[PDB]
């Protein structure tokens, strides 16, 4: 993590230089802050420092929960992160609410949770074959599962309250994304308990593995249903969705492959 | 191509039904067309029919120039097509010029040419190893090269004239994208002539292959230079680019890998 430490040190030095420049421009306490908030490049450097701190926190949390593993997990993280960044910015333009740093923070937190969900899926796929099974692995998995579930439930409840009170303007995107994340967490829990039952039973117990596949396909159906409902509401409210069309196609393709595999089997 | 024929027949039937409904609503010639252009779903069906016709023309052109080959070429086409669609819609939001079907047609033509460029790159990579070398292969390659070069030169000249006369509002995006496509066509021409020299000389003639690699890296440098210039102008005109950041990162990563490979060699 030498490169991460170097990057965070560089960002900290840059923000310290910006703060020092502002302070030496206005010796008081209020005008320096108002100049920082009025000048654009200084606020941009502050945003970069905030993003770097978020990245450091994400690295710490990933080391605590999963721990390194530096593999296709990282490649999937990068690919889905680029896709999610494109989708998020698209959905942001989808509405006139530009800038709005609180909404930017909300989107960043959503991206944080989505990246952690993808890493959880990759760790589940690694666990299904031949992991370093121990007490700590189970503890990490259950702790991450409970944390993600609690946070997702709280945020979806807040989104439901917001859309009931204010309306379906921008909070519905968060609601649907966190609903998809809840489906992902349900799939993760099902896969983990199935693998635990398979491991604790010594014998392969294949009669349940097919059932696990059944559960998987059912969950996929649920997911695609949610997505199509999203599409419906997104054509009911505004003109035409643009941000989620590619994820819709991906979900449709995955469900089609799953149902074809189930039929041929 | 059974599925493509079925899809085009379905789209043609749908547009015929829309036309018949409009005609039976207004028996004249002018009000039916004005109702089609005023109603949104009918114009959407017309747009879908236009896209399907464009897809059929693209299939015909691909069969004429490359010919099937149904491989990683198609996978790269799909991936880069999703990426380019996201980038194009992002660039469209980048400006207040919404709808504007002529600009939509221009973007569609740009996507058409970019997809054909990617297929040309994939065919070059296939040709470099062990293709079905013959007169027809050379004819196809040179014809596609000349067509792409002529079209790119004409469109970049038109973009230069537009930005000189009107200004850098939306035509600069087309100019930079077609400049990147021109660099791609230059790389394709260099690779093709290098492979032709390698094949016609019987002996491997490795002393030039390294030179070919040199040319490749040089072209990559040119590409990244163009991209950074794009970034500069895009921060000079408007607030902050959003559409091309991921392609910028991809180009930077490719150039970094190329320069590291050149240094270690």
Swiss-Prot record, chains A, B:
Not N-glycosylated. Auto-ubiquitinated. Deubiquitinated by USP19. Induction: By endoplasmic reticulum stress-inducing agents such as thapsigargin, tunicamycin or brefeldin A, but not by heat shock. Residues 1-251 are annotated as: Involved in FAM8A1 interaction. Residues 1-84 are annotated as: Necessary and sufficient for SEL1L interaction. Residues 26-41, 120-140, 191-224 are lumenal. Residues 1-4, 63-98, 162-169 are cytoplasmic. It is linked to In certain aggressive cases of activated B cell-like diffuse large B-cell lymphoma (ABC-DLBCL), plays a role in the degradation of misfolded N-terminal mutated PRDM1 proteins. This is E3 ubiquitin-protein ligase synoviolin. The gene is SYVN1.
